[PDB]
Amino acid sequence: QNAKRNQNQKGNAKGTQFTKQYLIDNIDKAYDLRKKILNEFDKKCFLQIW
C-alpha cells in the first residue's frame, strides 16, 4: 500500500501591550513644557526693555 498526506497549515498572532510607568521625577521635567516656548516669544518678538 501507498499513502500520501498533505497537511496545509497557517497561523496568526496579534500581541499588544500598553504599559504605563509613573516615575516620580517626570513632573519635575514636565514643569516647564510650555514655559520655554512661551518666553521664546519674549526672546524674539517683543521689546525686552522698558
Next chain:
Amino acid sequence: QNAKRNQNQKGNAKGTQFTKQYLIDNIDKAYDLRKKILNEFDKKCFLQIW
C-alpha cells in the same frame, strides 16, 4: 517487507513589531530641530550687521 517514506516539508514566518516609546525628554531635544537649520541661513547668506 520493505517500507520507504518521503516527508517533504517547508515553513514560513513573517514577524513584525511597531513599538513606540514616548520618553519625556525627547521633546527637549526636539525643541530646536528647525532652529539650527533656519539660523544657518543667517550664518551663511545674510548680512549679519545693521
